[PDB]
């Protein structure tokens, strides 16, 4: 029931639809109107609500009054969510039945042994000159487009391309997605790309031993078909979303595999990156700290001189 296929949805046994289609509060199309008139009058059994942690939103909880079901199963992976509405979910669906022990599944082989490592990078002395001078949201670019964080991304990509590892660089703040992925000549699912080249960049990543990295931006924050990565160099994501860094971790466990978390130290991202490990240390995961990488200065890394570093600050500060 997803507005493109509509495999005669009137009169079936299993209907696989989405949120915001059953709760679309505008004037619906005519093909969706005759299905919703059929779906509002049949008593179901076992509604399966995938990604339960978005149900206590204002528009996604009106689905449970439109559709009449006897029992309602809810399957999720990251039950934590901000704004304190997970306790509100105890009467929309019911009591929490089973939570899997995230370390018992690792010791038995059902989940890859993840070696979390919060490698943090120092701040450049030219960038910290303007970081403490402004407060109104322009410094989010400054702790994201750090030149000393650009080296630790380029070094960790090189260090795992020589081990034949499938690299995913999750990176929000889409201006710095472009300026990271064109200075390393790597593909990027920018997010407003298409439905077409989103499907072939993702397929050139799996069944091809030449294309090795990929620069997603806020797309893989759900149960998408990201094809079994091996490392995950997460750079400068959303603020304190401990739901996010348990969904970025979901790509890795699908040491064996290990994901990083690039932090520009002595900035506001240091306080953020301990809010997001607050859920993962309650499952058993241990976040190491890599203050200095294993020989970063010896290879051919970008932004060596200060002349090429002065041009990057004039590109960042020109946005405003």
């Amino acid at each position: 029931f997803t507005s493109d296929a509509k495999d005669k949805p009137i009169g079936c046994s299993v209907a696989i639809s989405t949120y915001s289609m059953l709760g679309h509060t505008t004037k619906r199309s005519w093909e969706a109107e005759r299905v919703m008139e059929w779906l509002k009058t049949q008593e179901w059994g076992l509604m399966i609500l995938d990604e339960v942690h978005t149900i206590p939103a204002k528009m996604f909880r009106r689905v449970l009054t439109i559709v009449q079901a006897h029992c309602k199963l809810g399957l999720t992976a990251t039950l934590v969510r901000e704004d304190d509405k997970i306790v509100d979910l105890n009467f929309l669906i019911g009591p929490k039945l089973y939570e899997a022990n995230w370390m018992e599944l690792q010791n038995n082989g059902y989940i890859a042994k993840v070696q979390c490592a919060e490698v943090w990078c120092p701040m450049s002395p030219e960038f910290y000159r303007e970081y403490v001078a402004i407060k109104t949201k322009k410094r989010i670019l400054l702790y994201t487009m750090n030149p000393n964080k650009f080296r630790a991304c380029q070094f960790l990509i090189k260090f795992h391309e020589r081990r034949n590892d499938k690299i995913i660089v999750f990176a929000d703040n889409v201006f710095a997605l472009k300026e990271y992925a064109i200075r390393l000549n790597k593909p990027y699912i920018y997010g407003p790309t298409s439905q077409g080249e989103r499907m072939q960049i993702l397929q050139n990543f799996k069944h091809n031993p030449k294309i090795n990295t990929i620069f997603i931006s806020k797309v893989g924050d759900t149960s998408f078909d990201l094809p079994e990565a091996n490392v995950l160099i997460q750079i400068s994501s959303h603020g304190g979303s401990r739901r996010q860094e348990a969904q970025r971790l979901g790509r890795v466990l699908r040491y064996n595999a290990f994901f990083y978390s690039l932090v520009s130290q002595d900035t506001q991202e240091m306080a953020y990156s301990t809010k997001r490990q607050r859920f993962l240390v309650d499952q058993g995961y241990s976040f190491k700290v890599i203050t200095k990488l294993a020989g970063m200065e010896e290879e051919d890394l970008a932004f060596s001189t200060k002349e090429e570093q002065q041009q990057l600050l004039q590109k960042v500060l020109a946005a405003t």
């Binding site: 397929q203 050139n204 069944h207 091809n208």
Partner: protein
Amino acid sequence: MKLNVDGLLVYFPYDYIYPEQFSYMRELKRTLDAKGHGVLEMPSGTGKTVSLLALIMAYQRAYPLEVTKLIYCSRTVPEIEKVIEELRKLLNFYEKQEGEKLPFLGLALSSRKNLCIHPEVTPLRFGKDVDGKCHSLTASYVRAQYQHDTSLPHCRFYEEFDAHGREVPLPAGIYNLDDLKALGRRQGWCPYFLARYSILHANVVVYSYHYLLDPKIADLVSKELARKAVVVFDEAHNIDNVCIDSMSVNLTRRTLDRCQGNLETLQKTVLRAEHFLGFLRRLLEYVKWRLRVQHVVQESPPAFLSGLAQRVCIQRKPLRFCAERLRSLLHTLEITDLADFSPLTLLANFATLVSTYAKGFTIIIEPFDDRTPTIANPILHFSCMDASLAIKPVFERFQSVIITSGTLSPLDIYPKILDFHPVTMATFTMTLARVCLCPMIIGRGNDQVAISSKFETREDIAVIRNYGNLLLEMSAVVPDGIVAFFTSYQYMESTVASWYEQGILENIQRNKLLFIETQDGAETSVALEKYQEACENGRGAILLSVARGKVSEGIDFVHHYGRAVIMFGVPYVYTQSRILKARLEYLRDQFQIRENDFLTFDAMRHAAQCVGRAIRGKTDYGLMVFADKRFARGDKRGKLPRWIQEHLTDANLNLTVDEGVQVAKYFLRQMAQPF
């Protein structure tokens, strides 16, 4: 194994059935109790044949008054013998389970050249030759002096048949064609006239299409056999092409110049009736006058019969009995062979078809030779447009008639062309323990160039290289046999001889041998026996052929022969022939079928027939690429049937050449491993 469908006790000859195969017997019982037709699509060749026979043969035991006889029209003589061997396996299972004998006989019918004992006539190669020399010994004037029983030529078996073969019938024991010759050998009877006599008292009867849908045959053999029967048209994709060619004749300059010799020999024998020879001499010089013109193509299906009464003054009331009196004239003339008058019977069959059948017909006279500006070669086609004019006896006479194949591509086209209304019109999909097929649509080339075989996109070497770069990179990752169907023969020549001038055909012969399937049957069977030898020893081969060919319909590519099947374009017919350009003008007014929705329907039933040849069995796996850009469109990949469409995902829909290899290289590695 006592298997219970909705009301019946079906005795299945196996142990494990497939979960879809129970619904095939369930949906076929839904036709027989409703006494109506049915268009069922069912993928496999065997398994479908033994589940259709397990139900209907068990249906006539519980309701022996509603159905009495099962007619099973198969394509040709190999599948005629295959169905009967699937019936002994069901009968002998019933012999073990019940321990008794039955009044149950099943036959098989074919031509006189498949049921023949007489030694002077059996090694005759052509089928029209054995019909004459039999008629030289079995005609009613040859037996006229055999009431004296002299030493004058005859058939030993035919005179021994009608003296003893009418009193006692065949008791039991399902007969092949070889069993009917063996029964005819040790008894001394004719096999052909014993099978045609006992076809009225049987329970399963397996012959070809042309005993039932051919109008000048079906009134002689299947006239008074059964009014409450069950007809099954097995492997019935090209019912439309069979009912057209059965009511379409072709006349040219070579045929009509031979009819003047037949009228010459008929003039020497009358002096040794006379109005009928002047009748035919009048008609022959009119059709020669109509082919005498060198002008534009023209069509006039009832107006031919008006101008035939102007210059010649011959009406349609004596013209309707033209082919009847010519059959009567050769009987009273006592001629030896009748294959020599085959041009004159073709003119007599043409004369009785213009007179009676003119609703959806045409006469297309083409003085313009194909592809050449001015070459003297005229031909008139009497082409039938309406494919429902040869089943109107069959859809009416019998009780329930079922049209079953494996690749009925839209199920709502076949009740639109053929004027009938089914009661089920169902489709099915085979169950699998793996993904036994990996269909992909390899679209754009390796340098993002479109790959399609249009008519303008054939000369440029940016596409011929991208076909050669595909067959090269699939011949290194596919084991033991690749079948590459091209769209035509002049495109197979102009691509293979343009791969050779580049450095592409040199690198394909390093991996696999390549065996071109040519038009003549002598080189083809040589190149096919070496192909199946090369797939069995180490090297592997490539049988590159033509989609509208002999190998595409007859030869079945079982496992490790043709692991991959490569379609080098959408196999369209010539879409500018004046016959096809006139049939589509009849399919637009009648039935309101769009002109473009029929050319793609015709192409997606020949591109899904030969691709579906790669998988026949339990453990058979097989790659099937579709190497054209136009296959990705919604009105083309939505046609090809639901058992090869439920594995064609959206990722394998515009794959490039190098990306299509790593889907294939991962698929064959996964299939190579045990269950």
